[PDB]
Amino acid sequence: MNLPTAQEVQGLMARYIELVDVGDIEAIVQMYADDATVEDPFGQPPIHGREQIAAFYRQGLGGGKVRACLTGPVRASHNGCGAMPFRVEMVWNGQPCALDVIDVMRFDEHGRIQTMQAYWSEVNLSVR
Amino acid sequence: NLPTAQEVQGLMARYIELVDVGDIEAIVQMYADDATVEDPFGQPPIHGREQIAAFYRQGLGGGKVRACLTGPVRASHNGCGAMPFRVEMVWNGQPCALDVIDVMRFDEHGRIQTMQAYWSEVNLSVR
Ligand SMILES: [Cl-]
Ligand SMILES: [Cl-]
Ligand SMILES: [Mg+2]
Ligand SMILES: [Mg+2]
């Protein structure tokens, strides 16, 4: 693949959720560019490179008990970017928690996620 | 410093509220002087307070475009947020829907510095 057209952005971003949804940490990290960055949550400094991004997803996913699902359609541009709304269900002190998130991604000219920014803070964390 | 995350859920909601009711001056009053609009994302940015009016007067001048949040605003703690919504509008004279996510930053007074609107045709439907 080259720089993903808008339909290509959509399928990639939905796969990405499918991988979070099963917790294939290594297939996730192989969707990123070797020198990608992750800002998650957006505002905290960035995480550079596949090693660090791998350490980030293992800590987040390698537990407890994380599921994820789109909560509306992916919105894709014609320059290989996109944004998607989703909800992450996890376990916290045995209490089922959920977190509403939007991730923005910019891809590269091979269909690899070049930057990801995840929008959320505690206003989107609803403990039940 | 900057609006609190909770001040972001409020500003971005109010923005939606004003789109829907169609108020252009109340939209345009939300934009800091040096703001930019990228709508769609993948174009060139629009900057100039008359240019940004004008952009809201084309879209909205007909008086019948609606809009509403389709899920919660996601607000950061560095002045920014992102929201999903659905627009009702006219295209090819047929009622249509368009799904959109806007990302916004704000300033140090609660006005908009950058707006980015993500969508393309893959997000247009015909009713
Ligand atoms: Cl949605
Ligand atoms: Cl949502
Ligand atoms: Mg699944
Ligand atoms: Mg590269």
Side-chain angles (χ1 to χ4, degrees):
Chain A
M1 199 188 279
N2 289 69
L3 190 74
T5 62
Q7 297 182 2
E8 286 181 326
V9 169
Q10 297 189 304
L12 285 156
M13 288 183 72
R15 175 173 174 249
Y16 170 91
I17 304 293
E18 289 305 301
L19 297 175
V20 173
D21 182 65
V22 80
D24 197 332
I25 283 160
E26 286 184 354
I28 289 171
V29 175
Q30 294 300 308
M31 286 190 68
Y32 283 92
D34 61 273
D35 62 343
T37 60
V38 169
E39 293 165 80
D40 188 336
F42 180 73
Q44 288 203 2
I47 305 161
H48 292 261
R50 277 187 179 171
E51 178 190 24
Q52 296 182 199
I53 295 172
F56 167 76
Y57 284 98
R58 194 160 293 285
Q59 286 272 56
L61 307 184
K65 293 177 171 187
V66 165
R67 303 297 307 260
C69 191
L70 293 160
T71 49
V74 180
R75 281 75 159 176
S77 73
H78 287 294
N79 69 342
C81 296
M84 60 181 163
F86 63 112
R87 177 172 284 219
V88 183
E89 302 190 16
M90 64 261 263
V91 299
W92 187 28
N93 292 333
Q95 277 198 279
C97 295
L99 180 70
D100 292 307
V101 185
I102 284 173
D103 282 358
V104 175
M105 288 176 179
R106 175 180 291 277
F107 291 84
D108 72 9
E109 292 183 345
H110 304 293
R112 298 202 188 88
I113 308 159
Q114 191 68 64
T115 74
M116 183 272 264
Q117 294 162 338
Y119 293 89
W120 60 274
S121 62
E122 69 279 6
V123 306
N124 308 115
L125 179 63
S126 64
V127 180
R128 269 200 146 177
Chain B
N1 221 286
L2 292 177
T4 69
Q6 287 89 350
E7 287 178 316
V8 165
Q9 300 175 293
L11 285 161
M12 294 185 65
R14 167 174 173 73
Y15 173 86
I16 291 297
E17 182 187 344
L18 299 176
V19 165
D20 184 57
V21 83
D23 196 315
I24 277 67
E25 288 76 27
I27 291 163
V28 162
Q29 283 178 327
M30 290 194 72
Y31 274 98
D33 311 323
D34 57 318
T36 70
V37 169
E38 282 170 281
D39 185 341
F41 185 82
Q43 292 287 328
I46 301 162
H47 39 93
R49 206 172 284 280
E50 180 186 30
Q51 291 67 40
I52 291 172
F55 160 81
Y56 283 105
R57 197 181 61 252
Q58 186 62 66
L60 302 182
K64 59 227 149 72
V65 180
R66 307 293 311 271
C68 61
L69 289 180
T70 46
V73 174
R74 279 67 159 191
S76 77
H77 287 289
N78 71 333
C80 303
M83 64 185 164
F85 61 108
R86 166 160 277 212
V87 177
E88 295 179 39
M89 55 195 311
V90 179
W91 162 91
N92 186 23
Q94 305 205 6
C96 294
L98 177 70
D99 298 294
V100 194
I101 277 169
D102 286 354
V103 177
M104 287 184 174
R105 184 174 318 250
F106 292 84
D107 75 8
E108 63 190 24
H109 310 284
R111 300 225 283 184
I112 303 163
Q113 197 70 246
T114 50
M115 190 274 262
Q116 297 174 333
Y118 291 83
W119 65 268
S120 69
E121 68 279 354
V122 309
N123 302 123
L124 166 74
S125 55
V126 179
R127 290 170 128 241

